[PDB]
Amino acid sequence: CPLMVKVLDAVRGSPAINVAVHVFRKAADDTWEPFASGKTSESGELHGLTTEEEFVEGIYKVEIDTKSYWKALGISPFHEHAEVVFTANDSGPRRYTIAALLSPYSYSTTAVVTNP
Amino acid sequence: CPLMVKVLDAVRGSPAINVAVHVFRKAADDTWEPFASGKTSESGELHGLTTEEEFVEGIYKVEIDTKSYWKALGISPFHEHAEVVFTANDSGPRRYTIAALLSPYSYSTTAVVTNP
Amino acid sequence: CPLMVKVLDAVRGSPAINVAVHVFRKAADDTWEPFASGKTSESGELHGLTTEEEFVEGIYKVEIDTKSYWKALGISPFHEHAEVVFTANDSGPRRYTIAALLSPYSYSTTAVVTN
Amino acid sequence: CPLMVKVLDAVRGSPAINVAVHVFRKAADDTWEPFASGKTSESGELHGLTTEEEFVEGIYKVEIDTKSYWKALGISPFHEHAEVVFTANDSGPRRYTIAALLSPYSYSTTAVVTN
Ligand SMILES: Cc1cc(/C=C/c2c(C)c3ccc(O)cc3oc2=O)cc(C)c1O
Numbered sequence: 001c002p003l004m005v006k007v008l009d010a011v012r013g014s015p016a017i018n019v020a021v022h023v024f025r026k027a028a029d030d031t032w033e034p035f036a037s038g039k040t041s042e043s044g045e046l047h048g049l050t051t052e053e054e055f056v057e058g059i060y061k062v063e064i065d066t067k068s069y070w071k072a073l074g075i076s077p078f079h080e081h082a083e084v085v086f087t088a089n090d091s092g093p094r095r096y097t098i099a100a101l102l103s104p105y106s107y108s109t110t111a112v113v114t115n116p
Numbered sequence: 117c118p119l120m121v122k123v124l125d126a127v128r129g130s131p132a133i134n135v136a137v138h139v140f141r142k143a144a145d146d147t148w149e150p151f152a153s154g155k156t157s158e159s160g161e162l163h164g165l166t167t168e169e170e171f172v173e174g175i176y177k178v179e180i181d182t183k184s185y186w187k188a189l190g191i192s193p194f195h196e197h198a199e200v201v202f203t204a205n206d207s208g209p210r211r212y213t214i215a216a217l218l219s220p221y222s223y224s225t226t227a228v229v230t231n232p
Numbered sequence: 233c234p235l236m237v238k239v240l241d242a243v244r245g246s247p248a249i250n251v252a253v254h255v256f257r258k259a260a261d262d263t264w265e266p267f268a269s270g271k272t273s274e275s276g277e278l279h280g281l282t283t284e285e286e287f288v289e290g291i292y293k294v295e296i297d298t299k300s301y302w303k304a305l306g307i308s309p310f311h312e313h314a315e316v317v318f319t320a321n322d323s324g325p326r327r328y329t330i331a332a333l334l335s336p337y338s339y340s341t342t343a344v345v346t347n
Numbered sequence: 348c349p350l351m352v353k354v355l356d357a358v359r360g361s362p363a364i365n366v367a368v369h370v371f372r373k374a375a376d377d378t379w380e381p382f383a384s385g386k387t388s389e390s391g392e393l394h395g396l397t398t399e400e401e402f403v404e405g406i407y408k409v410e411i412d413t414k415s416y417w418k419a420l421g422i423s424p425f426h427e428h429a430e431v432v433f434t435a436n437d438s439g440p441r442r443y444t445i446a447a448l449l450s451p452y453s454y455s456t457t458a459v460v461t462n
């Protein structure tokens with residue numbers, strides 16, 4: 001449960017369902033290594049991306065595939081994706097919720113970081 | 117469960133705890149009648165404001181006491197409160213989540229409306 | 233001069249044009265007295281609401297008529313209006329910009345207060 | 348002319364001044380090639396990044412160095428940077444403003460695309 005992604009739709013007033021999410025981790029050579037991926041559920045949430053063993057310290061990028069989401073709804077949006085880049089677990093394990101609120105030409109994102 | 121309020125703190129990356137919330141409903145004479153009130157919990161959520169019987173159609177105002185929240189934290193913020201005003205239940209009962217993301221000089225708010 | 237309102241549309245990626253904006257000042261009896269109003273321009277801005285002489289310290293409310301905006305574009309929105317309620321304070325910077333970014337079920341607002 | 352970046356601070360209610368901004372263009376091999384860069388002005392704006400001739404259709408990334416901004420103000424932030432990735436499209440309006448509103452653990456971004 002150390003990483004969860006929650007996505008909301010500001011046009012519909014609903015969870016953003018079936019949003020693809022790709023997580024990357026910066027490697028020692030400075031490239032972005034694929035780390036985990038998944039899709040938001042009916043409630044706009046994506047659980048089960050990783051484990052506390054696997055989710056070591058590092059710089060992580062959470063790519064939320066907003067264009068793919070809006071295009072699947074037959075809408076032409078502005079952004080390719082929403083990217084959230086952050087250092088994680090560098091003071092020990094934390095739990096991270098990455099939330100995003102989507103519109104066709106805009107988005108908001110926040111983090112909720114909790115210490116278990 | 118027809119009305120829930122969720123409040124997040126964009127400075128801390130945490131739920132906004134102990135935020136006072138006052139709900140009003142517009143009366144037939146156009147005044148704002150007190151309807152319900154409460155405080156956010158440790159998880160930034162406020163449940164139990166009303167019931168499906170009580171939460172009839174109307175125009176509702178959810179006042180989130182952001183100044184009181186920031187002042188209790190010893191911070192001087194810009195806004196007096198965040199107000200969310202909406203018509204509810206006019207196509208039959210719905211469930212409403214009013215979410216707000218707070219900063220000292222800014223806030224975001226959204227609604228998630230679901231049909232039970 | 234001391235107060236400007238700027239409104240943007242997050243669905244179309246544009247200024248929000250021809251949006252009605254009403255400003256009120258809180259009176260001694262806690263009622264909201266009309267203070268100034270207008271409609272946003274082609275750039276989504278509303279200038280000339282007040283003057284330094286008139287814009288004394290106190291609590292003000294800026295009401296942005298978002299519902300009518302969305303309905304005029306053929307879209308059904310959630311809110312009746314967006315409300316921004318704040319205290320004008322002489323000790324802080326002199327010029328207030330109240331900005332709002334609109335979606336059908338959401339809005340963001342910020343204040344940019346400068347000298 | 349065709350691209351402007353505007354950055355605001357939601358903690359202080361001000362423009363975000365002296366923020367480094369880097370623009371990249373996606374190359375044919377999917378790498379990000381440096382395109383333009385600068386630091387925001389006293390009004391939080393960065394003008395003069397490119398010209399109409401240079402700003403051809405394609406995918407661009409605007410990276411805003413938010414971490415350094417917050418640290419220079421003595422504040423610990425969440426993100427490494429804020430990223431805005433979009434396609435420039437000739438069929439749409441000609442001028443792009445990329446706006447960002449910053450908090451330590453959050454940001455909002457919008458596009459205002461006009462003629
Ligand atoms: C106004 C606004 C609201 C939200 C909502 C965030 C969250 C929301 C809405 C949320 C809702 C339900 C739940 O079980 C857990 C949740 O966790 C959240 O972080 C997120 C952003 C970025 C925003 O600008």
Ligand SMILES: Cc1cc(/C=C/c2c(C)c3ccc(O)cc3oc2=O)cc(C)c1O
Binds near residue numbers: 238333340355456
């Ligand atoms: C509530 C909120 C406000 C803004 C403000 C954007 C702009 C603002 C505030 C702006 C202000 C003055 C000006 O001369 C030009 C401007 O252009 C803008 O795009 C931008 C975001 C992302 C947001 O969430």
